[PDB]
Amino acid sequence: SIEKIWAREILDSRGNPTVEVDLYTAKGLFRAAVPSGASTGIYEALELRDGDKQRYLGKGVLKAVDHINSTIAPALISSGLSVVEQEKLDNLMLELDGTENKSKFGANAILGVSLAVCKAGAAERELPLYRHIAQLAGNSDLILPVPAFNVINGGSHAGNKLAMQEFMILPVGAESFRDAMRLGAEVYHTLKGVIKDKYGKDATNVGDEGGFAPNILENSEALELVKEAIDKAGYTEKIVIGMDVAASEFYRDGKYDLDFKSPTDPSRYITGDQLGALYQDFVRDYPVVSIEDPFDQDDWAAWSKFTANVGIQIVGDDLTVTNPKRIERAVEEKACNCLLLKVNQIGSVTEAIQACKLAQENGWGVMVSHRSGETEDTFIADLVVGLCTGQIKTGAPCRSERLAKYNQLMRIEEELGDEARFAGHNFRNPSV
Template structure:
């Protein structure tokens, strides 16, 4: 699977405390990776997160959970997954080994199989949010998963911050949260309108950065101005990410 594991400091009483909790957990994770895989495994990806050559999603979740435990935030930090399922959906099946050329095509899962997998993961790990669990056109299984009420189900590729697709998703109870990317919808005015649309439906809203970011910190002002309470800006590592968090602190 192509997955991004995130941590959510839901037990923090302030933004400063939230940053401290996440930063400490991030550095504990680095130590754990060094212990298990050696220092060479501590390379980071575009978003500042550790990019490991691991065998399964559970291996990654176990590492993250151990880091949370070592940092002492067992009950105060929860976990989230950005599945990015569109990337490995072929036809109507999901190729969990799509990045492994020698195994690609040998580990196909149906939508029903993926439902079972997410249900299992939410039961075994402190996962409170899953982003894009199914393909960009897989309305059926997304609705079925949202109906389970296991966690926040966040729409990205299926919604693309488009008001018409959001309206359909609201009417059909497809999601309960929106991932807002300003450049998807086009303008700041349009972004504000779709946030209001989502909030009127009692959805959560996550203001998100994009890959290959710069140090522009506008989304930090946007998340504060719109009061969404959720910002996805990458790990506390590189200047592109830290610029956003520093700006939130002073907004």
């Protein structure tokens, strides 16, 4: 059973409050913290913020923390449920909140406990967290994912005109996870130089996820820069590119604005067809293997049409919000073929594992993901290995809310020893 639960407000990687939970059992103290998105889809479970405009600019999480300390904690302690009972504990918190979208307590309240429970459960089972998660998920295997490093930041994560959010490199040809880290870092460092040589040092500062924030507008130019860095680093045969467009951020009036960080000008909007055509160009001209949120979270028609006309990975993020109900629709409409798995989009570990299992059962990839507001928490490193998904995006190899995860993946790889498997080229279908 749980002895004590105590939540507090900490600061995330952008300097905004978030929830941290300390959970005590007879095995010790288990601590987890909750990330926070910037480009948050409208269907995400509620992130409860205090809205006191004088305090942390409205972004405190005192209410969430209080819901944990005043309500969730005593209920879960009094239940006497063992922390190995992840689903029962998670379901009890869902029932306690009583709302579909976790708007009574906040998904951030619930998730913080959920995560700490999971860590505590692992200890109760005398298992590393990744193995506990694997058992929760009904997995026998463990595989190290290909990391997708967001090395050029745009969209809502960077001060630049670049509309698409993330340009990532995936070292699919690395020999191991540790090697993939080296490949990603070398390319990242190379890219700093490619950017400085063309744009000057003012273009070499970083956005929220640690990728460079060059002063460019054209998304194709981001791809060019990444491709050039890959080449210059000597890894053209081993590194491919993924993008997160985050198109819901620039959807306007049924159309899309690829200059949305510039003052409003509807004549520059393009249709979903035009946007798709651009993607096709990117796929033809660059080693783009994966595009996330190519279209708005409600533009089902565009997702389905596009997915049916390409062979690349198409990742639902805001489309699916780690939510089995949305995933079912996406599966039925063949809207995408990969789920981005963000535990705080849904609000509990159990529901995130269910979402993953649902995707995988329907033949989708799953990419575990950070949020752009992260913490020093490294849960998602254990999560991706336990869920065997083959792919994780958790930042550039810059800013330690990113490296914390990457370093933890290296540690897990080391732990697995000669049993360590790296998904490599099978990142989309690592089950094989």
